Enzyme design. Structure first.
Site, PDB file in Angstrom:
ATOM      1  N   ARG A 220       4.209  -3.516  -9.144  1.00 31.05           N
ATOM      2  CA  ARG A 220       4.403  -4.632  -8.355  1.00 31.05           C
ATOM      3  C   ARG A 220       3.475  -5.574  -7.930  1.00 31.05           C
ATOM      4  O   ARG A 220       2.157  -5.298  -7.984  1.00 31.05           O
ATOM      5  CB  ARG A 220       5.400  -4.170  -7.232  1.00 31.05           C
ATOM      6  CG  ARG A 220       4.506  -3.505  -6.072  1.00 31.05           C
ATOM      7  CD  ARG A 220       5.146  -3.419  -4.677  1.00 31.05           C
ATOM      8  NE  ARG A 220       5.360  -4.690  -4.110  1.00 31.05           N
ATOM      9  CZ  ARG A 220       4.785  -5.152  -2.954  1.00 31.05           C
ATOM     10  NH1 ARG A 220       3.651  -4.630  -2.769  1.00 31.05           N
ATOM     11  NH2 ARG A 220       5.451  -6.034  -2.359  1.00 31.05           N
ATOM     12  N   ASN A 222       1.923  -7.843  -4.868  1.00 32.43           N
ATOM     13  CA  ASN A 222       1.852  -8.376  -3.531  1.00 32.43           C
ATOM     14  C   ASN A 222       0.973  -9.817  -3.491  1.00 32.43           C
ATOM     15  O   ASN A 222       0.247  -9.939  -4.538  1.00 32.43           O
ATOM     16  CB  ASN A 222       1.369  -7.276  -2.367  1.00 32.43           C
ATOM     17  CG  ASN A 222       1.775  -7.622  -1.060  1.00 32.43           C
ATOM     18  OD1 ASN A 222       3.242  -7.791  -0.833  1.00 32.43           O
ATOM     19  ND2 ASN A 222       1.043  -7.976  -0.074  1.00 32.43           N
TER      20      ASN A 222
HETATM   21  C1  HEM Z   1       2.232   4.453  -1.817  1.00 35.78           C
HETATM   22  C2  HEM Z   1       2.279   3.433  -2.220  1.00 35.78           C
HETATM   23  C3  HEM Z   1       1.930   2.095  -1.142  1.00 35.78           C
HETATM   24  C4  HEM Z   1       0.823   2.298  -0.425  1.00 35.78           C
HETATM   25  C5  HEM Z   1      -0.050   3.190  -0.095  1.00 35.78           C
HETATM   26  C6  HEM Z   1       1.135   0.844   0.606  1.00 35.78           C
HETATM   27  C7  HEM Z   1       0.264   0.370   1.478  1.00 35.78           C
HETATM   28  C8  HEM Z   1       0.502  -0.559   2.238  1.00 35.78           C
HETATM   29  C9  HEM Z   1      -0.284  -0.838   3.339  1.00 35.78           C
HETATM   30  C10 HEM Z   1      -1.574  -0.277   3.904  1.00 35.78           C
HETATM   31  C11 HEM Z   1       0.234  -2.268   3.957  1.00 35.78           C
HETATM   32  C12 HEM Z   1      -0.353  -2.961   4.876  1.00 35.78           C
HETATM   33  C13 HEM Z   1       0.365  -2.662   6.249  1.00 35.78           C
HETATM   34  C14 HEM Z   1      -0.225  -2.943   7.532  1.00 35.78           C
HETATM   35  O1  HEM Z   1      -0.176  -4.404   7.735  1.00 35.78           O
HETATM   36  O2  HEM Z   1      -1.157  -2.466   8.391  1.00 35.78           O
HETATM   37  C15 HEM Z   1       1.253  -2.621   3.002  1.00 35.78           C
HETATM   38  C16 HEM Z   1       2.063  -3.727   3.146  1.00 35.78           C
HETATM   39  C17 HEM Z   1       3.128  -3.813   2.500  1.00 35.78           C
HETATM   40  N1  HEM Z   1       3.729  -3.071   1.360  1.00 35.78           N
HETATM   41 FE1  HEM Z   1       3.056  -1.299   0.841  1.00 35.78          FE
HETATM   42  N2  HEM Z   1       2.460   0.273   0.203  1.00 35.78           N
HETATM   43  C18 HEM Z   1       2.559   0.868  -0.903  1.00 35.78           C
HETATM   44  C19 HEM Z   1       3.932   0.787  -1.840  1.00 35.78           C
HETATM   45  C20 HEM Z   1       4.761  -0.264  -1.479  1.00 35.78           C
HETATM   46  C21 HEM Z   1       6.079  -0.622  -2.462  1.00 35.78           C
HETATM   47  C22 HEM Z   1       6.296   0.327  -3.295  1.00 35.78           C
HETATM   48  C23 HEM Z   1       6.506  -1.684  -1.646  1.00 35.78           C
HETATM   49  C24 HEM Z   1       7.915  -2.290  -2.251  1.00 35.78           C
HETATM   50  C25 HEM Z   1       8.106  -3.538  -1.873  1.00 35.78           C
HETATM   51  C26 HEM Z   1       5.772  -2.103  -0.414  1.00 35.78           C
HETATM   52  C27 HEM Z   1       5.743  -3.253   0.131  1.00 35.78           C
HETATM   53  C28 HEM Z   1       5.038  -3.799   0.975  1.00 35.78           C
HETATM   54  C29 HEM Z   1       5.315  -4.919   1.805  1.00 35.78           C
HETATM   55  C30 HEM Z   1       6.347  -6.123   1.542  1.00 35.78           C
HETATM   56  C31 HEM Z   1       3.940  -5.150   2.783  1.00 35.78           C
HETATM   57  C32 HEM Z   1       3.673  -6.281   3.548  1.00 35.78           C
HETATM   58  C33 HEM Z   1       2.812  -7.083   2.633  1.00 35.78           C
HETATM   59  C34 HEM Z   1       2.537  -8.622   2.907  1.00 35.78           C
HETATM   60  O3  HEM Z   1       3.428  -9.201   3.383  1.00 35.78           O
HETATM   61  O4  HEM Z   1       1.669  -9.169   2.456  1.00 35.78           O
HETATM   62  N3  HEM Z   1       4.643  -1.238  -0.482  1.00 35.78           N
HETATM   63  N4  HEM Z   1       1.503  -1.643   2.071  1.00 35.78           N
END
Ligand code: HEM
Ligand code: NA
Length: 333
Positions: A220, A222
């Site tokens: 995906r 981001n």
């Molecule tokens: C194992 C896989 C993943 C890891 C290790 C991961 C890790 C993270 C981390 C560390 C953050 C930052 C949180 C913070 O502010 O402290 C984050 C944000 C986010 N993650 Fe994941 N994530 C994963 C998979 C996914 C998947 C599959 C989605 C599907 C939508 C997703 C959606 C998001 C969203 C929407 C945010 C906020 C980002 C933004 O608004 O810029 N994540 N993720």
């Protein structure tokens, strides 16, 4: 590979026209909303960032120099809990195999049993080592190989119906820290994100990820914004970068504001059953971006209309009005 660029200090990073053309613009619509935006990570569009599972680009040497500096200052950006050592070797196998297949001009791998010979011509590395034997390499296997691939990596242990952040190399995060998040589960590390929990995005996503199989990886995009091409936007180094969010003016938006996109890979690691999460980070200045008038117009609309909690979460609040005013110039309606 062009001449060495910085992602700090003088910020000499810049994109060639080819790098601009292949930038992964992340907006399918004129407004953004969170969703389960996963797709199968199949090769498509030769020349694009989607062609290979791991994308090596013009900035490879620059970025590896940046990683080396981050780790010189802070070796604790890489962590591998002891139970994840097999998964670290799985990760090194996956990266070396794909890099040597997809970029044979830059990387070579030859193996006989656990006697491996890796060459990285771009970095002048010629290593004969023992797969599985960490004393055979100059450092721990995850650090060894991620010192040689762009973007960040987390390695998740899958147990008890969840994923746990038990290893990684996180030197270019969008404002998060592996030492903070170490050992957290999927919904836990996601706790700060607005909206998406109540929407079900994290419930649905966890379910998809738990079912990922060997040979069927998923991807995906981001995105966020960064002021200057600063890769190390970490909590650990806030005093070095957070202040720059107050430095945007109407005259300097194009040179300061950068769109940051993460091309994310989720791949099952075959011996350990762990999940590899690759976070491949692309940066483009808005001067560069608005080269493409369709991108410029769409970004105007996205930024004008972005839900305030999502803007605030992404850290764009302090300069958003200036940014929006600047981008309006590229939107004939
Ligand atoms: C194992 C896989 C993943 C890891 C290790 C991961 C890790 C993270 C981390 C560390 C953050 C930052 C949180 C913070 O502010 O402290 C984050 C944000 C986010 N993650 Fe994941 N994530 C994963 C998979 C996914 C998947 C599959 C989605 C599907 C939508 C997703 C959606 C998001 C969203 C929407 C945010 C906020 C980002 C933004 O608004 O810029 N994540 N993720
Ligand atoms: Na939609």
């Amino acid at each position: 590979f062009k001449p060495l660029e910085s992602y700090r200090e003088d910020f000499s990073f810049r994109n060639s026209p080819a790098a601009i053309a292949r930038f992964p613009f992340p907006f399918p619509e004129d407004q953004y909303m969170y969703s389960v935006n996963l797709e199968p990570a199949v090769s498509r569009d030769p020349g694009s960032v989607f062609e290979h599972q791991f994308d090596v680009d013009e900035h490879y040497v620059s970025e590896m120099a940046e990683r080396a500096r981050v780790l010189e200052l802070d070796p604790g950006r890489c962590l591998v809990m002891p139970h994840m050592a097999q998964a670290a070797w799985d990760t090194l196998a996956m990266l070396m195999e794909h890099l040597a297949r997809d970029y044979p001009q830059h990387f070579r791998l030859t193996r006989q049993g656990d006697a491996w010979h890796w060459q990285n011509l771009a970095l002048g590395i010629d290593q004969r080592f023992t797969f599985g034997d960490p004393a055979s390499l100059p450092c721990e296997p995850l650090e060894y190989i991620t010192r040689q691939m762009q973007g960040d990596f987390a390695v998740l242990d899958q147990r008890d119906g969840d994923l746990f952040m038990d290893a990684g190399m996180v030197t270019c995060p969008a404002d998060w820290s592996l030492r903070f998040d170490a050992g957290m589960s999927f919904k836990q590390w996601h706790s700060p994100v607005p909206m998406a929990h109540q929407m079900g995005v994290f419930d649905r996503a966890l379910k998809y990820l738990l079912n990922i199989q060997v040979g069927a990886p998923v991807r995906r995009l981001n995105w966020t914004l960064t002021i200057n091409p600063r890769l190390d936007t970490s909590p650990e180094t806030y005093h070095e970068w957070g202040n720059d969010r107050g430095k945007v003016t109407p005259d300097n938006v194009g040179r300061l504001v950068h769109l940051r996109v993460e091309l994310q890979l989720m791949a099952r690691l075959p011996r350990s059953n762990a999940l590899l999460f690759g976070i491949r980070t692309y940066l483009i200045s808005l001067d560069e971006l608005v080269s493409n008038p369709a991108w410029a117009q769409r970004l105007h609309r996205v930024m004008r209309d972005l839900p305030d909690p999502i803007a605030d979460y992404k850290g764009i609040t302090r300069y958003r009005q200036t940014l929006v005013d600047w981008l309006r110039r590229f939107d004939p309606e």
